[PDB]
């Protein structure tokens, strides 16, 4: 079996709502189509064993993001463009996936900050592991 990461493209910042690190009902507000996202795998980190989240949890954006750009601490995985406001990645081996929104395109919209998510993720109860990780990163529009 394999793991997969589903990224739901959304536009606009939360409206007084709290940050949720789990599945939530989709707002369904106008999404940004033709959005570019790319996955980068963090080396030395394997979500295959328990020790993996411990080391990974000690990760500092300072190491993956210091000069406003990624370092050698990341490995190129694949670049795909979200279409229809929804993107999905498959054939994912246990590790750490990092999503970066490319500046290219997005003329009426400004590039939002990137987000990081480990895969696979443990179940809400901590029992077993989930084969699919859901993410709802929002974009920041221009003006």
């Amino acid at each position: 079996e394999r793991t997969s990461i589903a990224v739901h493209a959304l536009m606009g910042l939360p409206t007084g709502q709290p940050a949720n690190g789990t599945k939530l009902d989709s707002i369904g507000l106008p999404k940004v189509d033709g959005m570019s996202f790319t996955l980068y795998r963090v080396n030395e980190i394997d979500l295959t064993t328990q020790a993996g989240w411990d080391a990974a949890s000690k990760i500092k954006l300072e190491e993956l993001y210091t000069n406003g750009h990624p370092t050698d601490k990341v490995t190129k995985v694949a670049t795909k463009k979200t279409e229809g406001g929804v993107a999905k990645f498959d054939n994912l081996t246990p590790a750490l996936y990092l999503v970066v929104q490319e500046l290219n395109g997005a003329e009426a919209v400004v590039r939002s900050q990137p987000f990081l998510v480990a895969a696979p993720q443990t179940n809400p109860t901590g029992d077993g592991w989930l084969q699919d990780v859901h993410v709802y990163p929002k974009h920041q529009a221009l003006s």
Partner: peptide
């Protein structure tokens, strides 16, 4: 929460 990384953006 324990498990997770940084996906505050919903």
């Amino acid at each position: 929460k324990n498990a997770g990384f940084e996906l505050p953006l919903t």
